[PDB]
Design a protein around this ligand. Structure first.
Ligand SMILES: *[C@@H]1O[C@H](CO)[C@@H](O[C@@H]2O[C@H](CO)[C@@H](O)[C@H](O)[C@H]2NC(C)=O)[C@H](O)[C@H]1NC(C)=O
Ligand SMILES: *[C@@H]1O[C@H](CO)[C@@H](O[C@@H]2O[C@H](CO)[C@@H](O)[C@H](O)[C@H]2NC(C)=O)[C@H](O)[C@H]1NC(C)=O
Ligand SMILES: *[C@@H]1O[C@H](CO)[C@@H](O[C@@H]2O[C@H](CO)[C@@H](O)[C@H](O)[C@H]2NC(C)=O)[C@H](O)[C@H]1NC(C)=O
Ligand SMILES: *[C@@H]1O[C@H](CO)[C@@H](O[C@@H]2O[C@H](CO)[C@@H](O)[C@H](O)[C@H]2NC(C)=O)[C@H](O)[C@H]1NC(C)=O
Ligand SMILES: *[C@@H]1O[C@H](CO)[C@@H](O[C@@H]2O[C@H](CO)[C@@H](O)[C@H](O)[C@H]2NC(C)=O)[C@H](O)[C@H]1NC(C)=O
Ligand code: NAG
Ligand code: NAG
Ligand code: NAG
Ligand code: NAG
Ligand code: NAG
Ligand code: NAG
Ligand code: NAG
Ligand code: NAG
Lengths: 203, 172, 280, 101
């Protein structure tokens, strides 16, 4: 809870400092205001009290200025929080590392004293395999490309698969789009691409 | 050497040194941007002396929690250890910590790439911080790593929103 | 700053109560949040990724933006240009950054080595190697440009990227005003410090602004009057400086949070936010 | 759901007229994660599976527009058994009547 607890600590420390400053005499004979008033007639007391006023007012202006700058921090955090409410609770955030590390799924707000906590549920991928890969794939002169995802091979066989989770799909005109012909594509690989229609017509 | 001084009633404290500052024959003193005297002509031997500060720097006490140990280390900020176990950092002279060649993640930060931790009979070590484990990404023009599995994280984030609604009647 | 080496003055600053301790706290929170800003911005990557020996990124040429082992501190070429373009004894000090500029350059190189070798993936999972030609075909797909428009133009795009990097070197070499933002942050801080220092030359109604003049001329019953004005004026100047610095620190923190967000969304990601990561 | 905005100036400010799509006339439907056909769990490519009661449809998510379910609105995965809450149906083959014809 270091963030919220430090905000509570900061505010309490600001108040406790402002409170302690009542005891600081600012060059007046005493810091107990009623003591000055019960010691001194106004010809004398007004100088002493005016030193206390000048000190206390300067301390108060200080505290309020600190609180205005801190309120700007808190308000920037509140607008940030309201945005995570709007984008991650009421929605899903496409924005990398805005709502938790990983690809964001959802967030559950849990209230906390003078703040909010988001349980940012995030998909994080975690068990890789290495594969041989290609930008595109020649069939008969045509360079095929993956519609969604990526081309890969285990070694002997080529597959298309999603970007974010290995799922070897057999390569077919359903998951591939043609563009032009092989020659312009640096690093194209041969393969074959399945015709998902002709074996039905043959059958 | 750091001394108190008085030239003709100009008091101060500092390391007086011989200087290259070419005063013209009418000048007696030279001044900083701060109006403090930066150089002087000695009133019995008309050479020019720089006046320079007796060295100073913040005493940053590094400590593990008292819920762990009473052992402590002191970063004297900026100073050279010649003026003050002992070790020297770009941040200052570091005393009571033990320098270590191994690079750990930063525990207590000290500055200029130095961090400290309480470790193995234990002592406060100080070290050049690891920026995390160094890793050759296995790049090649035809190699890709695809994740076969996931973990559903529940990374938890903890934002201030309000702060406690104080008010103060300034009259009171 | 207020009372340097005078006990006679240092006592009177205790009648002004807690002020010095909360000014030190305020400047310490400012100082600490610069390390925080720096780690929020750069330390978004948990491992120092590094580049391979063989730089065969499909025709793209990062040699100007990656480190060169020839460098004494392993900045890139362009980090060297940027470091060339951009440009005290009175209780004032400057603390070092926690990260040295070599650490910063090792992190920018890690972020960059990830970004080159692994796409967005090093932001989410572990860094996944992916060929740079194939990474750009995703980034074309990620702005609705169907990705054959990359490979069928691969050389042309490489030459445009390479040349555009070269124009950055020339612009940065010639045009010292390009760094006007950073140079203004540096200039503002230096101007504020020079102002803070210059306020030590100011009487505020005391018979001198050099404190030892008052203490050498005057006994305490008189000198307390004069030194209260120097305390008051110097303190009011210090509060002024610290308040300008707190507000400036909020502006820098907003800029850091913005940078951290471009780091996350556009280095570690690609951003769909129109005109967030450069026009286009 | 945001569409576009028109800026209009105002004294020391700006005003945006944020044109937004807001949906506003709900119908309740029986729904499923996926549809079993011949062993395969079909899923909607975009949209959701629904039924008024007796007939199953796929519809885009944000405006009820019933589409008859075919191979072309859908993607296969695996087989039925793993899927909690799957429902049966048929799924149409847009080639089959052309191939017979
Ligand atoms: C690459 O993946 C393919 C498909 O999963 C593997 O090919 C199958 O291998 C088994 C025997 O191990 C056969 O029963 C299947 O009929 C094969 N399918 C096809 C389409 O040929 C292949 O073994 C894998 N190769 C490597 C090197 O991992
Ligand atoms: C992909 O396969 C084709 C054949 O289907 C290869 O083309 C042959 O390449 C040799 C050497 O250049 C020529 O002698 C033949 O005349 C080519 N045949 C045809 C029909 O073009 C091609 O080289 C392969 N390319 C890759 C990148 O694997
Ligand atoms: C990558 O770009 C750099 C410059 O941005 C190229 O370096 C120059 O290469 C020529 C020889 O081809 C040398 O004569 C120059 O002195 C180099 N310049 C500098 C400043 O080092 C480099 O050749 C490019 N490499 C590739 C593979 O594109
Ligand atoms: C669910 O929707 C279907 C399709 O609109 C309805 O089926 C049609 O019903 C009308 C008479 O109400 C017939 O003329 C059509 O021939 C039917 N079409 C088909 C494909 O069968 C169905 O009645 C609706 N059911 C409910 C409970 O709303
Ligand atoms: C979906 O339809 C299939 C048949 O087309 C159902 O499978 C039969 O279910 C009964 C009862 O469980 C079994 O006795 C039969 O042996 C099953 N036949 C086959 C081929 O598996 C299936 O239960 C239906 N699904 C649901 C959710 O009702
Ligand atoms: C991928 O294979 C290379 C072979 O050189 C190896 O260095 C690397 O560690 C492997 N990566 C993973 C995630 O297994
Ligand atoms: C990959 O790099 C090697 C040399 O490092 C080169 O021989 C090969 O042709 C390249 N292949 C692709 C697909 O870019
Ligand atoms: C200091 O006194 C000596 C004689 O004791 C004399 O020679 C010297 O000139 C004096 N210094 C100056 C500045 O005249
Ligand atoms: C603090 O000390 C108590 C025992 O006195 C122990 O239970 C607790 O785990 C300690 N915490 C840390 C952070 O060392
Ligand atoms: C430290 O101080 C001594 C003088 O005491 C000086 O000779 C030495 O060069 C200094 N070392 C560094 C690295 O500053
Ligand atoms: C650090 O490493 C060197 C060898 O490079 C070794 O001689 C030295 O004793 C080590 N110092 C410490 C404090 O570990
Ligand atoms: C959906 O059906 C249930 C039947 O109990 C009813 O409670 C609910 O209000 C209905 N909603 C709409 C929008 O028709
Ligand atoms: C829905 O939930 C009820 C219990 O709440 C359960 O009996 C039923 O089988 C479930 N149906 C489906 C299709 O998941």
């Amino acid at each position: 809870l270091g963030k919220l607890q430090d905000v509570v600590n900061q505010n309490a420390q600001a108040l406790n400092t402002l409170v302690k400053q009542l005891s600081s005499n600012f060059g007046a004979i005493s810091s107990v205001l009623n003591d000055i008033l019960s010691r001194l007639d106004p010809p004398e007391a007004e100088v002493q009290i005016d030193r206390l006023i000048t000190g206390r007012l300067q301390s108060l202006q200080t505290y309020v200025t600190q609180q205005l700058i801190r309120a700007a921090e808190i308000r920037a955090s509140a607008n940030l929080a309201a945005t995570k409410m709007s984008e991650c609770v009421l929605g899903q955030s496409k924005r990398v590392d805005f709502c938790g590390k990983g690809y964001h799924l959802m967030s559950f707000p849990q209230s906390a004293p003078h703040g909010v906590v988001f349980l940012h549920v995030t998909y994080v991928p975690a068990q890789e395999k290495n594969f041989t890969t290609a930008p595109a794939i020649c069939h008969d002169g045509k360079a095929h490309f993956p519609r969604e995802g990526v081309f890969v091979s285990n070694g002997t066989h080529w597959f298309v698969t999603q970007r974010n989770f290995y799922e070897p799909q057999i390569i077919t005109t359903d998951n591939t789009f043609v563009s032009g012909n092989c020659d312009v594509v640096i690093g194209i690989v041969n393969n074959t691409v399945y015709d998902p229609l002709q074996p039905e017509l043959d059958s | 050497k750091c001394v108190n001084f008085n030239f003709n009633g100009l008091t101060g404290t500092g390391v007086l040194t011989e200087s290259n500052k070419k005063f013209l024959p009418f000048q007696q003193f030279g001044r900083d941007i701060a109006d403090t005297t930066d150089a002087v002509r000695d009133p019995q031997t008309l050479e020019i002396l720089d006046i320079t500060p007796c060295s100073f720097g913040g005493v940053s006490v590094i400590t593990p929690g008292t819920n762990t140990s009473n052992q402590v280390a002191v970063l004297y900020q900026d100073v050279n250890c010649t003026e003050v176990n002992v070790f020297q950092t770009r941040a200052g002279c570091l005393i009571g910590a033990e320098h270590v060649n191994n690079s750990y993640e930063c525990d207590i930060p000290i500055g200029a790439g130095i961090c400290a931790s309480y470790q193995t009979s234990q002592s406060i070590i100080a070290y050049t911080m690891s920026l995390g484990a160094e890793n050759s990404v296995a790049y090649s023009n035809n190699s890709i790593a695809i994740p076969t599995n996931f973990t559903i994280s529940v990374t938890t984030e903890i934002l201030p929103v309000s702060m406690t609604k104080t008010s103060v009647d300034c009259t009171m | 700053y207020i009372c340097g080496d005078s006990t006679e003055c240092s006592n009177l600053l205790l009648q002004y109560g807690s002020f010095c301790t909360q000014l030190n706290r305020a400047l310490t929170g400012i100082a600490v949040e610069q390390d925080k800003n720096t780690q929020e911005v750069f330390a978004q990557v948990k491992q120092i990724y590094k580049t391979p020996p063989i730089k065969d990124f499909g025709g793209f040429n990062f040699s100007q933006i990656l480190p060169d082992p020839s460098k004494p501190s392993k900045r890139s070429f362009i980090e060297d240009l940027l470091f060339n373009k951009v440009t005290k004894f009175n209780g004032l000090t400057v603390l070092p950054p926690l990260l040295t500029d070599e650490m910063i350059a090792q992190y920018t190189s890690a972020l960059l080595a990830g970004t080159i070798t692994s796409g967005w993936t090093f932001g989410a999972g572990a860094a996944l190697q992916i060929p740079f030609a194939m990474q750009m075909a995703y980034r074309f797909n990620g702005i609705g440009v169907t990705q054959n428009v990359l490979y069928e133009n691969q050389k042309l795009i490489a030459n445009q990227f390479n040349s555009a990097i070269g124009k950055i070197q020339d612009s940065l070499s010639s045009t010292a005003s390009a760094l006007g933002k950073l140079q203004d942050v540096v200039n503002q801080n230096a101007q504020a410090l020079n102002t803070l220092v210059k306020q030590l030359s100011s009487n505020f109604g005391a018979i001198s602004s050099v404190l030892n003049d008052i203490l050498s001329r005057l006994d305490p019953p008189e000198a307390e009057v004069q030194i209260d004005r120097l305390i008051t004026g110097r303190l009011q100047s210090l509060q002024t400086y610290v308040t300008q610095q707190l507000i400036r620190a909020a502006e820098i923190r907003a800029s850091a949070n913005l940078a951290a967000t471009k780091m996350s969304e556009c280095v570690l990601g690609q951003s769909k936010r129109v005109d967030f990561c450069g026009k286009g």
